[PDB]
Paper text:
Among the major RND actors in drug resistance in Pseudomonas aeruginosa, MexB transporter works in conjunction with OprM (OMF component), and MexA (MFP component). Archetypical RND transporters operate as a secondary proton/drug antiporter exploiting the energy associated to proton transport in their transmembrane domains to power the export of substrates through the periplasmic pore domain, 60 Å away, via long-range conformational communication. Crystal structure determination revealed that MexB as well as the E coli homologous AcrB are asymmetric homotrimers for which the three monomer conformations representing consecutive states were designated Loose (or Access), Tight (or Binding), and Open (or Extrusion).
Firstly, the 3.2 Å resolution tripartite complex structure in nanodisc revealed a 1:2:1 stoichiometry of OprM, MexA, and MexB with a OprM trimer, a MexB trimer (MexB-trio) and a MexA hexamer surrounding MexB and interacting with OprM in an open conformation. MexB-trio adopted an asymmetric LTO conformation for all the particles contributing to the cryo-EM 3D reconstruction. In the tripartite complex, six MexA protomers formed a symmetric dome on top of MexB with their lipoyl and hairpin domains, and used their β-barrel and MP domains for interacting with MexB subdomains. This MexA hexameric dome resulted from the arrangement of two non-equivalent MexA molecules (MexA-I and MexA-II) bound per MexB protomer. For MexA-I, the β-barrel and MP domains interacted respectively with the β-hairpin loop (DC) and the turn of the long β−loop (DN) crossing each monomer of MexB respectively without major overall structural modifications. Unlike MexA-I, the MexA-II contacts were at the vicinity of the conformational changes observed on MexB-trio. In addition to these stabilizing contacts, MexA-II MP was in interaction with PN2 domain of the protomer T which exhibited a conformational change regarding protomer T of MexB-solo.
Numbering used by the authors:
A (entry chain A), B (entry chain C), C (entry chain B): 1 to 455
Write the structure that this text describes.
Amino acid sequence: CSLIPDYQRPEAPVAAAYPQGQAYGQNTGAAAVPAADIGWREFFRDPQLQQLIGVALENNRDLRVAALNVEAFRAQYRIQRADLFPRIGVDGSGTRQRLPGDLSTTGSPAISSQYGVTLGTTAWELDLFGRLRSLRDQALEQYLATEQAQRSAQTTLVASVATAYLTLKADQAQLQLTKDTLGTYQKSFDLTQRSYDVGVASALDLRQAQTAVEGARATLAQYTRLVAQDQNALVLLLGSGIPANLPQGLGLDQTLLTEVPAGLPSDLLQRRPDILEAEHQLMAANASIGAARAAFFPSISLTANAGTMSRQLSGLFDAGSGSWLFQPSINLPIFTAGSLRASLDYAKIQKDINVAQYEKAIQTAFQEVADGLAARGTFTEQLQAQRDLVKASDEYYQLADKRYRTGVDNYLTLLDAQRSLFTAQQQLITDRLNQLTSEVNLYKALGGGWNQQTV
Amino acid sequence: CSLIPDYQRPEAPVAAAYPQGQAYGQNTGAAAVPAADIGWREFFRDPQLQQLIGVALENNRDLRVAALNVEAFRAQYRIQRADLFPRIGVDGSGTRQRLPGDLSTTGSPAISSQYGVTLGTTAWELDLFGRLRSLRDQALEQYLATEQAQRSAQTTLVASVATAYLTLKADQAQLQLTKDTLGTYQKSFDLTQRSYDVGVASALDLRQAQTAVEGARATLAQYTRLVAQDQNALVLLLGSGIPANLPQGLGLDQTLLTEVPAGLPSDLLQRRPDILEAEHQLMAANASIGAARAAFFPSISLTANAGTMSRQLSGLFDAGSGSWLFQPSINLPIFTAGSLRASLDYAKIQKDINVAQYEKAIQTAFQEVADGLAARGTFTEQLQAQRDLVKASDEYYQLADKRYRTGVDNYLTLLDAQRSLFTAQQQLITDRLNQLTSEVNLYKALGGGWNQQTV
Amino acid sequence: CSLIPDYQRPEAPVAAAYPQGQAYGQNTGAAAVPAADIGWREFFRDPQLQQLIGVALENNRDLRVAALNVEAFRAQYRIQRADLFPRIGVDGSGTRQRLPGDLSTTGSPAISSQYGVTLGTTAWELDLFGRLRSLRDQALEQYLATEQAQRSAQTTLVASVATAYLTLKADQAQLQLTKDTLGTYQKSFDLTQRSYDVGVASALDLRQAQTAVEGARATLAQYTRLVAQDQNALVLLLGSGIPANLPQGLGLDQTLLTEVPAGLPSDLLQRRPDILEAEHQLMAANASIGAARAAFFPSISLTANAGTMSRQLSGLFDAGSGSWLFQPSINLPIFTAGSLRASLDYAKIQKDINVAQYEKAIQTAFQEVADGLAARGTFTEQLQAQRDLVKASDEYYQLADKRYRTGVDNYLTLLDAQRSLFTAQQQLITDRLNQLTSEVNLYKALGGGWNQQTV
């Protein structure tokens, strides 16, 4: 009998197109290939982090945990799949009991004996009303939720390892520029020390140069700490150590990530795995509704066995000592004064709760992909302003170098312009890292790189 | 009879008065109307914010989830309410079985038959010592805890929506001020371009103005990203988007909130819902003590059913085929190695755990309201210092404007003072937003607006 | 016997030597006294902080929660320990039933009667293949896991108390130096007001001095907020009020901590308690395997009771009414579609999930210890840079004071020299506090002071 109600997908309350604004460009609309289709071998153009992701494909702990949990829920589904079949079980008994006089078969306290072994099925409940089929659907939906959870864990691990590698790649060049700053400040301090030893400058200019030398040295120590912490973070996110057979990495400013079209929100609930996980939870709640609905109807039970029984032990396996049994049973409670109706109410409440959580997850996913669209719309113009600033600092440094090589001004006002140059370009490298991290997070939230290659 | 232990509320280890110091303002004594009495329609002075809170009352997911969970705990309380009543039902039974020759009463392999359809009570659980009453009280306490969870969720939602709207307004005002800064830098760069094209200024003075206008352009892009993302963070918490027919949003420095007396910490013992969660969990643990202690006592069961039974089928519904049953049983385990004793002291330990977390919730609430009192005592003076800074910069700009229009200075050293004016002025909107956020989550931490109107 | 598979320790995937770099110092190899060896009392050299850890030893809430959960899992272990023994119980029985004529013993609607008081064992399983022993040491391993959770909570509490106390001292020193800043700014504003009232200085210098005075007055309120909020956090971590009988505190520049050797990656395999909790979860999953392995084997059941039965109520306690029963039973289900196989491989999969989580915990602990080693390798040079920066500003201030007292420059340049002096001085307390916080977190993650002294 059919008792699970018809499943229906709840409506997405968000707008069917992405909202616009001054930070956003033009919505390209729906496209042929969204971010769930492009694998991670095609998105990241650097081969080194690709080989790192290929290492983390098998050497990570949480991916192994989720891959085992998939098989766990598969075995839990197969347990209930086996429970639909009748359970054959060897049951061996034995009886030696005394009785009182008024209750005996003799009218006297005789010690009666009995022995019997049997095999067959006991309490074979027939799924006429779809209770065990509902539990089968519930175990199947939980297994599907587990594999969607493995997809989500793999995509988040890919994004985390990618951001850690790009952060290390940024901070290496930033440490190089801070070493350049320390060298510039050491040259400036040596020049002012020479000028103080000759007698032109006072002690105060020497102190005020040393106070900025110490500031550059402290910034160098901070950036070395950041480099080391990004290294040991990438080591943890990889599981194994950093390999030496890696290919040459590519620099940040040339494009390492391909562009993905924005698509539409609706295909995102077709493609993002946690929305499918909430959908599987909703279908599991509907299966529990079907189970609680099948709890109202009567229960059919069957017990059928065959074996040999006797009074003594050696006379059990004799010829003619066989015995068969057939008993059907029907159970139906009547006075359910708020037990089964409250259970059905509990199940309907669980379905409505999973509906609300499904719409909540839809709205959350829409919020983060809209934030990614905003970061995409703004970081290009931010790095354009940064690159123009670095260009202006470079022209300033070239003019100061021409002025120095003519002989008009000294090495001090060449050195400070040299300092301004790379303290501008390290603040280009910072926010180059931020556009790279924002694009990785936008690729992850739009469906992620569950597959390796493009479908 | 009932052997549930008596309930006593533990003593809070906090100070009876609010702590004092230097930045602490003077306490206004006992609060006649605290924050839990004050509704959200009276606290926020903006009609636009109250309209969107009225939207978020009905069109959010987790606020619906909490109410559905309240209905769920009501249903599971009704289950253990119905548990006290006996469960009668119909039981149909068929029997066709062979017997061995030595064990039969006739001495033959008899294929005997039996049929019957009985009606009545089987295994009637009798609550003689309040075990089922203790489970009913545990279900009721969990229902009250789920009831308080909806108030906690509504207060956190009201605070989050209020702070999100305030951050949106503050970001819009700061975006307008960065637009003015970009206009000022554009005018100054055009004037330096004119001076360089004439021949009075060198290229270096052009390059530094270019760096200034590029840095301001990057800051404008960053603040436009902030404005674009805070609308997303608001629309996510609202569920729906921003409506078109909205009331006029009042100003940030204009009064948007009302004063709330902090009163006493003991009033928070009546008013913050998480302490009520810990209290309901404590009483549920006491109900579990009652259950585990009533598990010691003997359990009485009853089986009484009547109906028709026969050897054959069509002779079931005959005259005189009726028969009744009466079987009272009493089960009592005696010798264990402290099994039920371990269940009993396990439940007592669960009570002591709930006492300890009941005290830690009081300590967390005390620390939160003390941080709110510190922010209240500091922000009113910090914003006054910022306002004095703003008016000093405004007097500076006015004197520079008079000095410009008399002809003494050029437009550049008017524009830089005009620039310093609103770059100091955005530091009023910043920390005005922080004072408003501190007052909002202090209002939430004191109990919040669970009701719409003040009682 | 026992079907439990024998346990052996999995492989630690990380490198067995601490990784080296430019910021990393020399590894001192393995050491006999790690962080878990010495107690917390001789580590923190402040007697006040030791007294606050001493009152945190008893007056905290989560420590009490952890000790009570330890006793809870002990009681749950004693439940399964008592489960080996037979449950001897008394079962009082009454029986009065009518029967149909074709099924009765007389051919008549006879009302048969029976009464009985019986005492003995029912359904007593005999642990032949080690299932109940597996559940017993499963609960025992969970109890040891809860003990390691208690140790982890205690070490986390000690680390949090130490960080809060040192942050209190740092914020107090920063508040004192910002008070000195407000004083010098007020003196500079008074001298500028005198110069404006005489007539030498225009109003613009007065405005731009007043803006600086307001900028320092904002920082004063911003730091006196943080002093009080950190006092609040300390009171929350302490669980009670701040004691008035405290010993004197020692400042941050004095030796507050002691040297702890980093040792080896293997030493944490013995000493950090969350790894011990993970391997206790390992042994719990292995005991789950050992409990699931007994389902394939036959199970023993026993039912044996003696007592007095009769047909009448008062005729129960009569001579000759004593009777006994002996009933053995053997159960073995045979036909399944992989039910018990999937349950067993499900338990094995849970064990493999546990080995993967056990490796992940070791990897995260190694990452945290690498962060602590990098902070130790860098904050010494950062503090040296801040210290000789302070010394340079002090020599600057002394030369400016000599130049003032000979009469060359005014009080104004002396005041703005003292301004930068204690600015660079308050920039030492930040990154002194960060070094001490990093060393406290390193001592926590390396094993912590679970004991009070060294043993």
